[PDB]
Amino acid sequence: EVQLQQSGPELVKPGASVKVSCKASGYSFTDYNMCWVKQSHGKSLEWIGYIDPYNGLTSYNPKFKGKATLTVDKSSSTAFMHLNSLTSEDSAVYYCARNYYGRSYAMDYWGQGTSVTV
Amino acid sequence: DIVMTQAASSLAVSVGEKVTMSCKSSQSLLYSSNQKNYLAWYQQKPGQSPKLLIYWASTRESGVPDRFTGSGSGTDFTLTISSVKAEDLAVYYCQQYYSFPPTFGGGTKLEIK
Amino acid sequence: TSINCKNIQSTQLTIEHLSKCMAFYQNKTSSPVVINEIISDASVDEQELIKSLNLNCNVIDRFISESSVIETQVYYEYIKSQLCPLQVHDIFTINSASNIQWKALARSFTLGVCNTNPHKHICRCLESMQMCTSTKTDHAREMSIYYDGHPDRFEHDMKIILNIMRYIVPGLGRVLLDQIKQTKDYQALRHIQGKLSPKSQSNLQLKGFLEFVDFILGANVTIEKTPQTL
Ligand SMILES: *[C@@H]1O[C@H](CO)[C@@H](O[C@@H]2O[C@H](CO)[C@@H](O[C@@H]3O[C@H](CO[C@H]4O[C@H](CO[C@H]5O[C@H](CO)[C@@H](O)[C@H](O)[C@@H]5O)[C@@H](O)[C@H](O[C@H]5O[C@H](CO)[C@@H](O)[C@H](O)[C@@H]5O)[C@@H]4O)[C@@H](O)[C@H](O[C@H]4O[C@H](CO)[C@@H](O)[C@H](O)[C@@H]4O)[C@@H]3O)[C@H](O)[C@H]2NC(C)=O)[C@H](O)[C@H]1NC(C)=O
Ligand SMILES: *[C@@H]1O[C@H](CO[C@@H]2O[C@@H](C)[C@@H](O)[C@@H](O)[C@@H]2O)[C@@H](O[C@@H]2O[C@H](CO)[C@@H](O)[C@H](O)[C@H]2NC(C)=O)[C@H](O)[C@H]1NC(C)=O
């Protein structure tokens, strides 16, 4: 069907940068944009931002504007999230979820998630 | 921005019983031009990714059982499960996609006894 | 040279040039005129015909809509400007019957970018009448991710804009809007919107709406122009 596979877990010492991959299958990658969600070990879910693969343009939550940077490679249908200057807060599981503009920012298909530990 | 508050951090029910969860919003999530509440319900089973249950606060995604129902307007929304099954034990979240940025609730853990 | 709305040269039949003969563009808010003096400089035959029509401010836009002769439509539009100054400029007064009708239309229509992002300023301006002062550059930073590279969405909102403006400027303006819609030549819309912005400074909601139009016309998107009937 529709599948979003994410990179394996990451252990990073504080101060370094980590990059997470999201491979899309089963749909046209440029018709739906990519949303990234930080879920701490607590129940909290936080919306980081989204990126239109066709535009390449991005929109970030003001909270994560400095911490995160989203890019895409349309050829391999892959979306990348980059986190720089990791700290104690940045330890969390990061999710990659599809979104369609016709249904505002509601996410139907979610990736597996990637645990980033600092 | 908008803050979403959910009634119960966790609630315990027996199998077969009818359960109701609440999601309240700081600001009205209803856009009057299209008359659609910008609100969604997710189910996150243990150690798994959140699954989309309901969008627009009423419409439920394809593949979501008939048991799950969602209703509400303005700032007050509720998710209702008809006859709970064992498979349903999970953490249920709600999301507002009205204002920037999209914000989530604390989550409501359905525990089964 | 210069365009006479009573006598329009054949080469002047483009949206840009015809735009100059809209009734509001004549800057007559006052001194409504009896029709006989309005047509005093015209052929006696055309004078007897126009007099025979029994025109008044209520049906004149409909007579303009019925005629298939663009020169006749422009002429009747000039007649409308001299005969019906208050009806012509009724839309720019911040509270008017026409302005209320247009407001109802705007609240009723849902733009695509509004459906995706109801928090945006333009949506607030059309629905709840707030946030109506925003530059095209703010609109660019906000909504460029929504429109750029999406012809379908761009045309979707563009048709809606064309309906709302369809009810701003009846008569010749409506004909020009229908022509733009038919030909997908959406950049020509400037010629209407550009002539409407400085007229609209007293009305904040109208000013903000037209500003949004200015932004959206500049979206990075390629459109193909279907053939013209003129
Ligand atoms: C009823 O009143 C209206 C007033 O609302 C009046 O309309 C004006 O008429 C005057 C005189 O006829 C026009 O003045 C001319 O302006 C020429 C330059 O115009 C260009 O730039 C305009 C300004 O753009 C700036 O500002 C905008 C915001 O407004 C901003 O986005 C930009 O940053 C930009 O810097 C612009 O409005 C104008 O656009 C017109 O034309 C386009 C294309 O046709 C159309 O889409 C628009 O809707 C608008 O109609 C245009 O882009 C100027 O060059 C010109 O010529 C003089 O200078 C040259 C120099 O070589 C000389 O050769 C020449 O002989 C002149 O001396 C003249 O000054 C003014 O533009 C009109 N305004 C509008 C909005 O149309 C009507 O005429 C009145 N009706 C009557 C009298 O019957
Ligand atoms: C205006 O658009 C062009 C092309 O469209 C954009 O770029 C592509 C990625 C396309 O798939 C769409 O998502 C975008 O809307 C912009 O870029 C150039 O496009 C050509 C293709 O013709 C490409 O080969 C170049 O590398 C691109 N970059 C250049 C020429 O610098 C262009 O940059 C856009 N302009 C603005 C101001 O946004």
Author numbering:
A (entry chain H): 1 to 52, 52A, 53 to 82, 82A, 82B, 82C, 83 to 100, 100A, ...
B (entry chain L): 1 to 27, 27A, 27B, 27C, 27D, 27E, 27F, 28 to 107
C (entry chain A): 467 to 696
What does the paper say about this structure?
The OBV M segment encodes two glycoproteins, Gn and Gc, derived from a single polyprotein precursor, with Gn encoded upstream of Gc. Compared with other bunyaviruses, OBV Gn is relatively small, with an ectodomain of about 200 amino acids (aa), whereas Gc, with an ectodomain of ca. 900 aa long, is about twice the size of its Gc counterparts from other bunyaviruses. Our structural analysis has revealed that this region is composed of two domains: a 27 -kDa α-helical head domain and a stalk that is divided into two identically folded 19 -kDa tandem β-sandwiches. Furthermore, the head domain is well exposed to the environment and is a major target of the humoral adaptive immune system of the OBV mammalian hosts, indicating that the trigonal pyramid of the spike shields the functionally more critical membrane fusion core machinery from the host’s antibody response.
